[PDB]
Amino acid sequence: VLVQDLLHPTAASEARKHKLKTLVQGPRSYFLDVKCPGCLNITTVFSHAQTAVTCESCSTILCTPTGGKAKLSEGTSFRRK
Amino acid sequence: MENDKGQLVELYVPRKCSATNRIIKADDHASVQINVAKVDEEGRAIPGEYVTYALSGYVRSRGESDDSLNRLAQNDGLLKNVWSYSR
Amino acid sequence: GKGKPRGLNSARKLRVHRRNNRWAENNYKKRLLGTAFKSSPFGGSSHAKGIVLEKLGIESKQPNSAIRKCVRVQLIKNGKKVTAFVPNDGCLNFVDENDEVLLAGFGRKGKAKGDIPGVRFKVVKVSGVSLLALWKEKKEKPRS
Amino acid sequence: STELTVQSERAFQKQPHIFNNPKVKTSKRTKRWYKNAGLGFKTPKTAIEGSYIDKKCPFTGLVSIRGKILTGTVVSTKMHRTIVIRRAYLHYIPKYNRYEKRHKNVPVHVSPAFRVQVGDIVTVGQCRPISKTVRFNVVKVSAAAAXXXXXXXXX
Amino acid sequence: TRSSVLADALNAINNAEKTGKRQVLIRPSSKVIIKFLQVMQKHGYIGEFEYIDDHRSGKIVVQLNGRLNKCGVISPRFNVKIGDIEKWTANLLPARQFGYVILTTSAGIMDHEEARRKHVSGKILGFVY
Amino acid sequence: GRMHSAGKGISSSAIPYSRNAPAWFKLSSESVIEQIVKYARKGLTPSQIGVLLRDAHGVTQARVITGNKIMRILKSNGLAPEIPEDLYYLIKKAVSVRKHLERNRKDKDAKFRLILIESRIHRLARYYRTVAVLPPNWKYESATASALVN
RNA sequence: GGAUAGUGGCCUACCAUGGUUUCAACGGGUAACGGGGAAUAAGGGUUCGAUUCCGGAGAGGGAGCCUGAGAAACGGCUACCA
RNA sequence: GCGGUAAUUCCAGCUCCAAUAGCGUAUAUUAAAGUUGUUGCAGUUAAAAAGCUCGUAGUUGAACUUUGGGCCCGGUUGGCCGGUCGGAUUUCCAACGGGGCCUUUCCUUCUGGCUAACCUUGAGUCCUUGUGGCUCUUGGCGAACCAGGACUUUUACUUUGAAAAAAUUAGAGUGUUCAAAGCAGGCGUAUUGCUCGAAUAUAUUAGCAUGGAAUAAUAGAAUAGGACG
RNA sequence: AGGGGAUCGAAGAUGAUCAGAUACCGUCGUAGUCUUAACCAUAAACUAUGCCGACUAGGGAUCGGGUGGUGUUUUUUUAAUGACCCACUCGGCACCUUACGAGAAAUCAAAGUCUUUGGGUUCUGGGGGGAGUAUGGUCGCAAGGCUGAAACUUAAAGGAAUUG
Ligand SMILES: [Mg+2]
Ligand SMILES: [Mg+2]
Ligand SMILES: [Mg+2]
Ligand SMILES: [Mg+2]
Ligand SMILES: [Mg+2]
Ligand SMILES: [Mg+2]
Ligand SMILES: [Mg+2]
Ligand SMILES: [Mg+2]
Ligand SMILES: [Mg+2]
Ligand SMILES: [Mg+2]
Ligand SMILES: [Mg+2]
Ligand SMILES: [Mg+2]
Ligand SMILES: [Mg+2]
Ligand SMILES: [Mg+2]
Ligand SMILES: [Mg+2]
Ligand SMILES: [Mg+2]
Ligand SMILES: [Mg+2]
Ligand SMILES: [Mg+2]
Ligand SMILES: [Mg+2]
Ligand SMILES: [Mg+2]
Ligand SMILES: [Mg+2]
Ligand SMILES: [Mg+2]
Ligand SMILES: [Mg+2]
Ligand SMILES: [Mg+2]
Ligand SMILES: [Mg+2]
Ligand SMILES: [Mg+2]
Ligand SMILES: [Mg+2]
Ligand SMILES: [Mg+2]
Ligand SMILES: [Mg+2]
Ligand SMILES: [Mg+2]
Ligand SMILES: [Mg+2]
Ligand SMILES: [Mg+2]
Ligand SMILES: [Mg+2]
Ligand SMILES: [Mg+2]
Ligand SMILES: [Mg+2]
Ligand SMILES: [Mg+2]
Ligand SMILES: [Mg+2]
Ligand SMILES: [Mg+2]
Ligand SMILES: [Mg+2]
Ligand SMILES: [Mg+2]
Ligand SMILES: [Mg+2]
Ligand SMILES: [Mg+2]
Ligand SMILES: [Mg+2]
Ligand SMILES: [Mg+2]
Ligand SMILES: [Mg+2]
Ligand SMILES: [Mg+2]
Ligand SMILES: [Mg+2]
Ligand SMILES: [Mg+2]
Ligand SMILES: [Mg+2]
Ligand SMILES: [Mg+2]
Ligand SMILES: [Mg+2]
Ligand SMILES: [Mg+2]
Ligand SMILES: [Mg+2]
Ligand SMILES: [Mg+2]
Ligand SMILES: [Mg+2]
Ligand SMILES: [Mg+2]
Ligand SMILES: [Mg+2]
Ligand SMILES: [Zn+2]
Known part of the structure; x- marks a missing residue:
């Protein structure tokens, strides 16, 4: 206030702002590999789904969509990248 | 505000806020001058020796006189930490 | 930027808009409609000479109480009938019916002057010899 | 405009004073005359290869182009061998210090050496009174059609 | 918008x-x-x-x-005609001694005194004192 | 902010700075293009295909891994539909609104929503028609639009 | 094609259906001849120009024409109207 | 607003004020008027947002495409000296503008005519120890524009310039005795003539003509019917 | 034009009241009030406040969406759920305090960033009456709607606040 660093804002009070009102806008969503031990290989999923994503082979499930992030189904794991 | 040949004409070069650099004019009986005493070895505040700061009425009314004092004095060596430039 | 189109090629809209709103100016409207020539007992002219029909005693308005000595006059270029004041103490003695008087405006753009209700004119000359000269007595009315 | 027939009038359509002697056997039947208008306006091949007559042609006719040279955009191509072009321009009004879009429609004769369509931009040369209203003649087509075939069907 | x-x-x-x-x-x-x-x-x-x-x-x-004090934009980029740079600065500049009216010319975006020495002109962009 | 209501809501995708990468993304241009076309064969829309590719596969943006917008990929392999898809879904809607209004002539609200939709149709169509993707003289009309969409 | 000193629907014959218009056509008003100009002095404007110079139009109102290089002339003729 | 009995507004006398060979009146118009508002108005309650939404004409409309650096050429003010018999120019110097270059960089383009300019050099030198300086023809500049052929995306803006009646306006000169004016006039050997003038400015919108390439539009290559050869 | 017509109830009739009382109050109660098919297009149709865009200041509530949690309560075997709590951020309906700033003031987060006068655009007003009258055009079955003057008259009409 009165004088402040607009070019180097603290990543704390930048983390709080709106995805469009940041210094250079970018997403707040992420991808993740998901597994269901019946299979040995993994599927790449977006955090906000819309489409209820099904695995490679087994007609299983993975996630049912919502107003935002997807809800991964029961017994599943996920590393993020 | 000189004149034709040299000669500084026109009286009264007014003060100036150290926070905004807007003029401090006469009828502003709400601006302020803060004398900050230069100390020396082991306490001892040296009477008749100050680092001074002028603050305009606008800033004090706006509530920015504390925060702007911190910034002004700290980047003048009589404070460390306290103030952050980012936020 | 309230109202007016600010842009660089809207000179048409600005001109027209001015044209339209000039009409709300009472004297532009008068000048363009030709009211001068159409209404108004004079022709638009500065003066007009007429004939004295009868001598009237108009009672003044409030809060004044007088009798305002006027003349009904019929304009020679119009036949229009017009009630006109005879100014100064006396002077109504100077007129008489059927005489030929030079009426002028009252200096109020139309509009009646003071307390004389609905008199928008005044007598300047009778019989070609001007009230003022007669009142002071520099002149004397013609023979008949 | 024209097209077809050539000889489609009660009068014989001929170029004046361009004799083709019948004794002299020729392999081109009719002898044709042409020129160039000047100001660097190429007399297009459709005027020299053509067979039409148009005495109001600036290249194959009896009219000289001189004076103004203007351009407009073709808005009417319904009169036989003549068009009407629009000439927009901004007029400066001082009092308000801005402009206002104006326009005028010039009637202009068009030789059948040009295939003109509404929308094309055309360059037009002044010439002697051709008709009651026509004081200009098309001397260059600076357009084409405006990507007409690029509106074709699906894949 | x-x-x-x-x-x-x-x-x-x-x-x-x-x-x-x-x-x-x-x-x-x-x-x-x-x-x-x-x-x-x-x-x-x-x-x-x-x-x-x-x-x-x-x-x-x-x-x-x-x-x-103020830096403003003249919203219709009015065309200025070498004589009119006079009347513009006159209109909106606190004094002759200082302040600039900046405009666009075909010799670049430049203040009015620059435009005067360079002796070019064009459209008016804004002003600043 | 919003043309046919007074709503002002900001809401969109926030596109990333990184115009290339994900680096962690293996595959190839070859791969996803063939994925695009196989789904286009399935009858999906470029919107539908982008979403499906963005969650079920790893396609952050189809335009980054293949320097080509999905609609151009569909166009090149000769899959572009007759009209664009935003104009389609608008017309499709107007069709359903109208059908509902033929059934319920007492729903004045639907009439008002039909005007708005149709006006949006006509302005969009006018844009497309300016930029030559719709044949100059292409016009929406209720009698032929029901037949159009289906 | 005729007519003109000559271009041109200027006019006639045949043929076509064109031309202008909210960027205001067409119509109505003007106590309207147009310009050089005039009055009003921060500027931007507002108002005015029958009238010493330039252009146009008329010679009570219309039309017609003789003479002639030049007039549709009026301090020319001819006819009608007043 | 004055006048109904001590009228500062009437009718007069006195005195006094303002303008003065002039002063009052009426009508119009201009200023005052930011009460027509482009500059530059106002619209909750004073005059004034259409009950509401669509919407054509109109006006308006996000950002982005040669930016940056290097070198040369010559101007016009200003300083510190003046060398000089008030003005003079070279070097020392900044300041502010103009032109052309090389950086991947069309300048419309061929085919000669023409060359002013150096990558030249052919000699060396006037002269400060030498790149301070130009005459000077024999390998090596395009564009400075002639003229012929072949073609060219369209505009707006601005700059300068031509074409530009007089009187009017602005304004220089000139002592109509002053002045409004007028364009005269001024010098001697005033016996046999000598001579300065009769400027300059504005003159816009449109059309013409040249320079600019920011700001605004416009056109281009996507069913390649694209570009060069 | 059909239906419907319980309720209340312009009209009308009455009882009282009053000097009068065509009212106010009481009673009866026609039309209407309800619905269908058509008209009509006006309300203080009000926030008496055009729309789109930018910027300028603190605060606690609240509605919808979302994110974050080894938060609470719900028991079962931990969860999952669901409701609840705290922090955040969008878009809402609002209030609070401020007032840098604006106004003639009442007041106003716009009615602000306006003589230091220019983001884009639409509409309206130019003293009071005369008068939303006259006239024409147009729309309607009608009642009426839209468009809409002038002659004349007049020095105030008006706004907000203060004191009485
Ligand atoms: Mg009115
Ligand atoms: Mg009045
Ligand atoms: Mg009488
Ligand atoms: Mg022809
Ligand atoms: Mg035809
Ligand atoms: Mg023709
Ligand atoms: Mg928004
Ligand atoms: Mg809209
Ligand atoms: Mg959304
Ligand atoms: Mg002829
Ligand atoms: Mg016809
Ligand atoms: Mg027609
Ligand atoms: Mg009009
Ligand atoms: Mg007349
Ligand atoms: Mg006139
Ligand atoms: Mg005249
Ligand atoms: Mg006259
Ligand atoms: Mg002439
Ligand atoms: Mg006479
Ligand atoms: Mg005659
Ligand atoms: Mg004569
Ligand atoms: Mg007659
Ligand atoms: Mg007395
Ligand atoms: Mg007095
Ligand atoms: Mg007296
Ligand atoms: Mg006087
Ligand atoms: Mg003024
Ligand atoms: Mg007014
Ligand atoms: Mg202006
Ligand atoms: Mg001003
Ligand atoms: Mg006002
Ligand atoms: Mg009101
Ligand atoms: Mg409203
Ligand atoms: Mg409307
Ligand atoms: Mg832009
Ligand atoms: Mg450079
Ligand atoms: Mg340079
Ligand atoms: Mg010029
Ligand atoms: Mg009932
Ligand atoms: Mg009753
Ligand atoms: Mg009773
Ligand atoms: Mg009754
Ligand atoms: Mg009752
Ligand atoms: Mg109303
Ligand atoms: Mg209310
Ligand atoms: Mg309202
Ligand atoms: Mg707030
Ligand atoms: Mg949660
Ligand atoms: Mg404030
Ligand atoms: Mg206050
Ligand atoms: Mg009024
Ligand atoms: Mg009527
Ligand atoms: Mg009926
Ligand atoms: Mg009626
Ligand atoms: Mg009305
Ligand atoms: Mg009426
Ligand atoms: Mg009074
Ligand atoms: Zn699986």
Whole structure:
């Protein structure tokens, strides 16, 4: 206030702002590999789904969509990248 | 505000806020001058020796006189930490 | 930027808009409609000479109480009938019916002057010899 | 405009004073005359290869182009061998210090050496009174059609 | 919808100065904004500014001091005719001794005294004192 | 902010700075293009295909891994539909609104929503028609639009 | 094609269906001849120009024409109207 | 607003004020008027946002495409000296503008005519120890524009310039005795003539003509019917 | 034009009241009030406040969406759920305090960033009456709607606040 660093804002009070009102806008969503031990290989999923994503082979499930992030189904794991 | 040949004409070069650099004019009986005493070895505040700061009425009314004092004095060596430039 | 189109090629809209709103100016409207020539007992002219029909005693308005000595006059270029004041103490003695008087405006753009209700004119000359000269007595009315 | 027939009038359509002697056997039947208008306006091949007559042609006719040279955009191509072009321009009004879009429609004769369509931009040369209203003649087509075939069907 | 990007940056600069600030994030920046801010800085009414590159249209962080009373944009880029640079500066400049009217000419975005020495003219962009 | 209401809500995708990468993304241009075309064969829309590719596969943006917008990929391999898809879904809607209004002539609200939709149709169509993707003289009309969409 | 000193629907014959218009056509008003100009002095404007110079039009109102290089003339003729 | 009995507004006398060979009146118009508002108005309650939404004409409309650096050429003010018999120019110097270059960089383009300019050099030298300086023809500049052929995306803006009646306006000169004016007049050997003038400015919108390439539009290559050869 | 017509109830009739009382109050109660098919297009149709865009200041509530949690309560075997709590951020309906700033003031986060006068655009007003009258055009079955003057008259009409 009165004088402040607009070019180097603290990543704390930048983390709080709106995805469009940041210094250079970018997403707040992420991808993740998901597994269901019946299979040995993994599927790449977006955090906000819309489409209820099904695995490679087994007609299983993975996630049912919502107003935002997807809800991964029961017994599943996920590393993020 | 000189004149034709040299000669500084026109009286009264007014003060100036150290926070905004807007003029401090006469009828502003709400601006302020803060004398900050230069100390020396082991306490001892040296009477008749100050680092001074002028603050305009606008800033004090706006509530920015504390925060702007911190910034002004700290980047003048009589404070460390306290103030952050980012936020 | 309230109202007016600010842009660089809207000179048409600005001109027209001015044209339209000039009409709300009472004297532009008068000048363009030709009211001068159409209404108004004079022709638009500065003066007009007429004939004295009868001598009237108009009672003044409030809060004044007088009798305002006027003349009904019929304009020679119009036949229009017009009630006109005879100014100064006396002077109504100077007129008489059927005489030929030079009426002028009252200096109020139309509009009646003071307390004389609905008199928008005044007598300047009778019989070609001007009230003022007669009142002071520099002149004397013609023979008949 | 024209097209077809050539000889489609009660009068014989001929170029004046361009004799083709019948004794002299020729392999081109009719002898044709042409020129160039000047100001660097190429007399297009459709005027020299053509067979039409148009005495109001600036290249194959009896009219000289001189004076103004203007351009407009073709808005009417319904009169036989003549068009009407629009000439927009901004007029400066001082009092308000801005402009206002104006326009005028010039009637202009068009030789059948040009295939003109509404929308094309055309360059037009002044010439002697051709008709009651026509004081200009098309001397260059600076357009084409405006990507007409690029509106074709699906894949 | 956004109608003059020059206007937004300028006004924003003005609300900053009046609110007693020293910095200001303007959006969305353009060549014309850069060159206005460059003539403003060429005469010290602002300090140094900084173009941050979002992969869109841009952002500018202007560092400003406080010798700026007002910097305005003349919204219809009126055409000025070498004689009329006189009447413009007369209209909106506090004095003959100082202040600049900046405009666009075919010899570049430049203040009126520059445009006078260079002896060119064109359209009027804005002003700053 | 919003043309046919007074709502002002900001809401969109926030596109990333990184115009290339994900680096962690293996595959190839070859791969996803063939994925695009196989789904286009399935009858999906470029919107539908982008979403499906963005969650079920790893396609952050189809335009980054292949320097080509999905609609151009569909166009090149000769899959572009007759009209664009935003104009389609608008017309499709107007069709359903109208059908509902043929059934319920007492729903004045639907009439008002039909005007708005149709006006949006006509302005969009006018844009497309300016930029030559719709044949100059292409016009929407209720009698032929029901037949159009289906 | 005729007519003109000559271009031109200027006019006639045949043929076509064109021309102008909210960027205001067409019509109505003007106590309207147009310009150089005049009055009003921060500027931007507002108002005015029958009238010493330039252009146009008329010679009570219309039309017609003789003479002639030049007039549709009026301090020319011819006819009608007043 | 004055006048109904001590009228500062009437009718007069006195005195006094303002303008003065002039002063009052009426009508119009201009200023005052930011009460027509482009500059430059106002519209919650004073005059004034259409009950509401669509919407054509109209006006308006996000950002982005040669930016940056290097070298040369010559101007016009200003300083510190003046060398000089008030003005003079070279070097020392900044300041502010103009032109052309090289950086991947059409300048419309061929085919000669023409060359002013150096990558030249052919000699060496006037002269400060030498790149301070130009005459000077024998390998090596295009564009400075002639003229012929072949073609060219369209505009707006601005600059300068031509074409530009007089009187009017602005304005220089000139002592109509002053002045409004007028364009005269001024010098001697005033016996046999000598001579300065009769400027300059504005003159816009449109059309013409040249320079600019920011700001605004416009056209281009996507069913390649694209570009060069 | 059909239906419907319980309720209340312009009209009308009455009882009282009053000097009068065509009212106010009481009673009866026609039309209407309800619905269908058509008309009509006006309300203080009000926030008496055009729309789109930018910027300028603190605060606690609240509605919808979302994110974050080894938060609470719900028991079962931990969860999952659901409701609840805290932090955040969008878009809402609002209030609070401020007032840098605006106004003639009442007041106003716009009615602000306006003589230091220019983001884009639409509409309206130019002293009071005369008068939303006259006239024409147009729309309607009608009642009426839209468009809409002038002659004349007049020095105030008006706004907000203060004191009585
Ligand atoms: Mg009115
Ligand atoms: Mg009145
Ligand atoms: Mg009488
Ligand atoms: Mg022909
Ligand atoms: Mg025809
Ligand atoms: Mg023709
Ligand atoms: Mg928004
Ligand atoms: Mg809209
Ligand atoms: Mg959304
Ligand atoms: Mg002829
Ligand atoms: Mg017809
Ligand atoms: Mg027609
Ligand atoms: Mg009109
Ligand atoms: Mg007349
Ligand atoms: Mg006139
Ligand atoms: Mg005249
Ligand atoms: Mg006359
Ligand atoms: Mg002539
Ligand atoms: Mg006579
Ligand atoms: Mg005659
Ligand atoms: Mg004569
Ligand atoms: Mg007669
Ligand atoms: Mg007395
Ligand atoms: Mg008096
Ligand atoms: Mg007296
Ligand atoms: Mg006087
Ligand atoms: Mg003034
Ligand atoms: Mg007024
Ligand atoms: Mg202006
Ligand atoms: Mg001003
Ligand atoms: Mg006002
Ligand atoms: Mg009101
Ligand atoms: Mg409203
Ligand atoms: Mg309407
Ligand atoms: Mg732009
Ligand atoms: Mg450079
Ligand atoms: Mg240079
Ligand atoms: Mg010029
Ligand atoms: Mg009932
Ligand atoms: Mg009753
Ligand atoms: Mg009774
Ligand atoms: Mg009754
Ligand atoms: Mg009762
Ligand atoms: Mg109403
Ligand atoms: Mg209310
Ligand atoms: Mg209202
Ligand atoms: Mg707040
Ligand atoms: Mg949660
Ligand atoms: Mg405030
Ligand atoms: Mg207060
Ligand atoms: Mg009024
Ligand atoms: Mg009627
Ligand atoms: Mg009926
Ligand atoms: Mg009626
Ligand atoms: Mg009305
Ligand atoms: Mg009526
Ligand atoms: Mg009174
Ligand atoms: Zn699986």
